Design a protein around this ligand. Structure first.
Ligand SMILES: CCOCCOCCOCCCCCCCCCCC=O
Ligand SMILES: [Fe+3]
Ligand SMILES: [Fe+3]
Length: 222
């Protein structure tokens, strides 16, 4: 806390959707951290700094698409995120800070970390430097969210178990929907799943969940 042919129509086609998802994910991260600031007004300056970070990342990932001569399929990306975006919006409107934090700071960050770690060894030299820069910049020891959830665990255990039950399957469906395009990019779905589960288990351990609790939570993916 072998390399694909980056110039082929097959590669560019799959990249148009993967690149769009990463770009949209970064925009949504910016919007979510600002929204979280309305729930945690004393966290506004840290959340503004984290939102500026994600926008820097959005620009770097936009340049990855441009460098390969690929037009990002933004409509596909907006639809890909719509279920999780809807649940974040519902929790936000209800003032459900633990749900908002689990979605953004835990699920989405672990999803991003796994994607970046899996992509790095199979990426083009331009995108590799951008992605490595993004991982060597997803940072505090604990996120605004480990740290707030670690500090507030006793008041929000049941909501966290509910948020996980509702949102972890959405993350699994997202991984299923993009597995084909990820394989075109020479990424193995099993590596993505393994890295996500490890990153998510690490965050849950840090927050104060025990092994049995984590096992039951990870099982909600099915
Ligand atoms: C239940 C296992 O779920 C496995 C999910 O594995 C991750 C597969 O994701 C590959 C698609 C790439 C999407 C990257 C998301 C970018 C979000 C960046 C937002 C920054 O906080
Ligand atoms: Fe990011
Ligand atoms: Fe992030």
């Amino acid at each position: 806390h072998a390399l694909p042919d980056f110039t082929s129509d097959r590669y560019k086609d799959a990249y148009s959707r993967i690149n769009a998802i990463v770009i949209e994910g970064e925009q949504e991260a910016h919007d979510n951290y600002i929204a979280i600031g309305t729930l945690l007004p004393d966290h506004v300056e840290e959340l503004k700094r984290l939102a500026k970070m994600e926008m820097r990342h959005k620009k770097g990932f936009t340049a990855c698409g441009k460098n390969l001569g690929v037009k990002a399929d933004m409509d596909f990306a907006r639809e890909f995120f719509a279920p999780l975006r809807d649940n974040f919006q519902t929790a936000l409107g209800q003032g459900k800070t633990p749900t908002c934090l689990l979605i953004q700071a835990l699920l989405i960050e672990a999803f991003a970390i796994s994607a970046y770690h899996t992509y790095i060894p199979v990426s083009d030299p331009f995108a590799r430097k951008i992605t490595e820069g993004v991982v060597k910049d997803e940072y505090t020891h604990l996120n605004y969210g480990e740290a707030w959830l670690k500090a507030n665990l006793e008041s929000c255990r049941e909501e966290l178990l509910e948020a996980n039950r509702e949102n972890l399957p959405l993350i699994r469906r997202m991984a299923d929907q993009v597995a084909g395009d990820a394989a075109v990019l020479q990424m193995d779905k099993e590596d993505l799943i393994e890295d996500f589960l490890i990153a998510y288990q690490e965050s849950l351990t840090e927050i104060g969940f025990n092994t049995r609790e984590i096992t039951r939570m990870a099982a909600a993916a099915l």
